[PDB]
């Protein structure tokens, strides 16, 4: 029916017959994520060492430069750059761009646009399929966490060098330095984050085990129980009342969800809310609102400080603080 080029293009873009839905957020998601993917793979394999701390001490993060999969990483941008925009065209040579940690900014900037567009693309397909539009809201929790460690934390700290390195061992260095400077473990938001993932892991195991325990017999013992379910079934494949009866006796009757809709909202809310707060926690600690500091909180009658477990944590925090970025500090306070 449509004869105009744009009318035909817009029909193809929003077409739900494509193998992978594109949509209008996809014309932003696909080019940005492919750009970040291409440079990430190339940089993870063959990028030269990067002077991350701005002290002319390059750090090797590539496979072809002596790293394995665990220790390989895309090194963050140089501390000399700071938060300044460093596209490849602002560098005199591509060798200089690689030396100063250019690929990190290219990945992070295009990746942030990709996940934001991926979130919108999740809404768009739901609208095209006529379903309720809040899977994207649940996806905002991991997006916030990714945005916090790649954008907001570098923003508050003043440098992209303080972002999370794009690597496995680089991630661990990010966490350890983060504990030493902010005491993230004592922050109530990582506490909520831990309850979000420990609880989410618990609820996933319980919901999965309770549904599996209640499968209605539809197969023999020489076949997988999965065969008892046919894709497109109009009837239920497990007995919800039986599962509620088991969990009702397990703790007590009113500690169990009799409602599948309430149960599944709880399965979604608990991890999403938990990840929202731990994402906020990193964002708040980006502006140096650190976790609880109970050092020397307990003192005896004469004033002698009685140590607690918090003070032992401070001893570990002290060790990381005096060792991270060994040659980078000329002055006693780590204000940056």
């Amino acid at each position: 029916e449509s004869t105009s080029l744009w009318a035909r293009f817009c029909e193809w873009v929003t077409s739900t017959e494509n193998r992978l839905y594109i949509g209008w957020f996809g014309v932003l998601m696909i080019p940005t994520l492919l750009t970040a993917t291409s440079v990430f793979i190339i940089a993870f394999i063959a990028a030269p060492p990067v002077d991350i701390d701005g002290i002319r001490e390059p750090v090797s993060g590539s496979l072809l430069y002596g790293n394995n999969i665990i220790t390989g990483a895309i090194i963050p941008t140089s501390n000399a750059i700071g938060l300044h925009f460093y596209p490849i065209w602002e560098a005199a040579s591509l060798d200089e761009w690689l030396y100063n940690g250019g690929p990190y900014q290219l990945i992070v900037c295009h990746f942030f646009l990709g996940v934001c567009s991926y979130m919108g693309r999740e809404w768009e397909l739901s609208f095209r399929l006529g379903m309720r539009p809040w899977i994207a809201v649940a996806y905002s929790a991991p997006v916030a966490a990714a945005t916090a460690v790649f954008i907001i934390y570098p923003l508050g700290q003043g440098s992209f060098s303080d972002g999370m390195p794009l690597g496995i061992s680089g991630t661990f260095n990010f966490m350890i330095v983060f504990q030493a400077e902010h005491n993230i473990l004592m922050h109530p938001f990582h506490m909520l984050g831990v309850a979000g993932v420990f609880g989410g892991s618990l609820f996933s195991a319980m919901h999965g085990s309770l549904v599996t325990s209640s499968l209605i017999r539809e197969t023999t013992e020489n076949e997988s129980a999965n065969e008892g379910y046919k894709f497109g079934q109009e009837e239920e494949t497990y007995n919800i009342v039986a599962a509620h009866g088991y969990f009702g006796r397990l703790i007590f009757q009113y500690a169990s969800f009799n409602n599948s809709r309430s149960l599944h909202f709880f399965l979604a809310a608990w991890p999403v809310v938990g990840i929202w707060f731990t994402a906020l926690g990193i964002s708040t600690m980006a502006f140096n609102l650190n976790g609880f500091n109970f050092n020397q909180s307990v003192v005896d009658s004469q004033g002698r400080v009685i140590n607690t477990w918090a003070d032992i944590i401070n001893r570990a925090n002290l060790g990381m603080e005096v060792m991270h970025e060994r040659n980078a500090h000329n002055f006693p306070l780590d204000l940056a």
């Binding site: 030269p48 002319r56 390059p58 000399a80 005199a92 040579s93 060798d95 200089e96 030396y99 100063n100 060994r326 040659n327």
Partner: protein, 240 residues
């Protein structure tokens, strides 16, 4: 930009432009240092902006004709020495003696050779004492160690601070294989710089010209042999 032109610009009009890394140009003036009254002047605003970095490489093609190959700058516009002060003595016969005292007088620079080899060096004119005529007056200067005595290597080993062994290897540490790396030294070296006067403004007490400097590279606290770096560029100063 002359010195007066630069002073007529706000910091926000310079920040990011890159002209902050340029020595002032001396226009008009004269080409004869004789216009300078003989005496001992006070060197001020002395600045040396490089125009080229070349590093000598041993020739694998035999012949021993080690030549200065071209390089690519790696650390951006952070390589001009400025605010350098001292004394400048002018002789009636045209003899010139320059002596630097304070100021930046040093800047870490890294360049990359063909093949992907980053060669760092500490471009410096520290304790520069040059004597000669107006057309060419050269002298030697102190090139301090690229890394200070308290610089810790990725294994925590340093000169004045750090481990003296490979702690990662409790048994094979302190072996003959690692003796060179375990022991670190921060001794300095020396370089030769030849200056030349091209423009001299007697009225404003400003001089300018070109220079050529040859100095060793970073030795990695004594872990590697230094290469030879030739730095050619412009220079400017204000006698007062």
């Amino acid at each position: 930009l002359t010195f007066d032109q630069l002073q007529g610009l706000t910091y926000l009009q310079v920040k990011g432009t890159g002209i902050a890394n340029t020595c002032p140009t001396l226009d008009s003036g004269s080409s004869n240092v004789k216009d300078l009254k003989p005496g001992t002047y006070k060197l001020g605003k002395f600045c040396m902006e490089p125009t080229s970095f070349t590093v000598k490489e041993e020739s694998q093609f035999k012949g021993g004709d080690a030549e200065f190959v071209p390089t690519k700058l790696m650390t951006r516009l952070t390589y001009t020495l400025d605010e350098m002060s001292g004394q400048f003595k002018v002789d009636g016969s045209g003899n010139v003696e320059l002596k630097e005292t304070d100021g930046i007088d040093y800047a870490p620079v890294t360049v990359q050779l063909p093949g992907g080899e980053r060669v760092p060096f500490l471009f410096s004119v520290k304790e520069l004492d040059a004597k000669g005529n107006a057309d060419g007056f050269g002298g030697e200067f102190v090139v301090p160690s690229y890394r200070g005595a308290t610089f810790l290597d990725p294994k925590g080993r340093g000169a004045a601070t750090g481990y003296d062994t490979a702690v990662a290897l409790p048994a094979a540490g302190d072996d003959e294989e690692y003796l060179k790396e375990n022991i670190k030294s921060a001794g300095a070296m020396k370089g030769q710089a030849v200056f030349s006067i091209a423009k001299v403004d007697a009225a404003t007490g400003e001089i300018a010209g070109v220079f050529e400097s040859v100095q060793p590279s970073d030795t990695d606290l004594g872990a590697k042999a230094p290469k030879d770096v030739k730095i050619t560029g412009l220079w400017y100063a204000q006698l007062s």
